Amino acid sequence: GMASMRILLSNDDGVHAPGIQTLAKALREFADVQVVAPDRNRSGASNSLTLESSLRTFTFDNGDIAVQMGTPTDCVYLGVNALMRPRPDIVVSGINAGPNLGDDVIYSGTVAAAMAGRHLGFPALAVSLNGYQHYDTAAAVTCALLRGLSREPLRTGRILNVNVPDLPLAQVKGIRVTRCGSRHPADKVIPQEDPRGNTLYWIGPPGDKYDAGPDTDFAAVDEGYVSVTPLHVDLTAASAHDVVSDWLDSVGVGTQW
């Protein structure tokens, strides 16, 4: 083949995570892979990034790069813009231990790292396992996608959010393009007293599934299919445009009459 694929691999769980190390191993059978990922498994970074401080990096013997206290986004940013020359063809983020579905996606560091490689020659993949077991299956599904992208370019969609059923590969039904489901608002806080009687608060579990119908990511994964949802960064709720303009006129905001 005329060209090697050069892949920037990141994740949310840090460089030591088995999900990213399993995927790296699988990708390296056919691709060049540079890992740039958080130094440790931190929870809940979303697409935060480090602006108030400079970031420190560390290179392992195998060449993996960990960014110290780096967010998922930090790592992809540094990887694309400084640490990999020339720039990667594609950012692959995963494999995440745990699903990234529905309206959770915006909170996902795994998705954020992909999000950050949306301007490369291929659409970025965010890869999450619905579980902790079959990294092998998600690795294989990722490999298949990537061979697919190199066979024919995907013309529209700069980020693909891929959720893989936690099954042995032979039981995965196939792949469906899906939209993000939704959840009810999350509302649990779990209070816990410290030894001095002060109340500290844990953020609780997500809200219950609300939109999990036939074409959602939630449905696809439950039915044993890989879910693929293309994502974009534009948060515009266009359907609300007229209602909002009409409301402002109605309440006299921005207009004198």
Place this chain on the structure above:
Amino acid sequence: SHHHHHHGMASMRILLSNDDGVHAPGIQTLAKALREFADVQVVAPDRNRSGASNSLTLESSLRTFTFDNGDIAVQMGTPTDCVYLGVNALMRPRPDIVVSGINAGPNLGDDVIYSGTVAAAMAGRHLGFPALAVSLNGYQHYDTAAAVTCALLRGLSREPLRTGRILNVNVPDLPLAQVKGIRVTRCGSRHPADKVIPQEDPRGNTLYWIGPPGDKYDAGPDTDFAAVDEGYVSVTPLHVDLTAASAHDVVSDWLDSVGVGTQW
């Protein structure tokens, strides 16, 4: 009955947060304005968290500190933690709405997915009134951003806003008299940011700064960038759904075409 700019000194309960933290001039100016006519509770980060984006604290609990005036700082809390805790635990009576702001600096374009200002408003989307994220295009005219936010809040008192759960509001950094009006906008977009600034530590290790956002790419006439450049307050309604609906078919055809995951 009596004629005043606002009807009631505490007609609505507002959870006010931001991402610059509880000491920020943005939030303090706004708080003072809102307290004219609203029952305001500040729940905000203990310090600056710009580009905390929608992150949240899941593997540790959080501790709060309450100031003399009743402001709550969530110690190391992200803007999302603050709203989530304020809404779901701390506030009684619960808020009618979340206001987030006034941020020192704009939250325009494809930057909005990175804004902690916007993330706090996004955590308040389920409440009765749409959550407002208010960011000043600059550092000067907090007064102007406060007047704008007060005008939208009074407006919500006149008539509820039916569709649209977050409103991202950018306000030109001008005296109020020079703001031309309001536009309902769409998010513009930027080129990829591409600068990384290296800086040696005292030991000669190279550390890296994240550079500024990339150039404007789409600043067309109905965008938030254009509105603010032209001296209008931009209001973009936002959602949290990241699905690229208009890419669905293309992706679907692509998969069929290369046959990934299908036997033949």
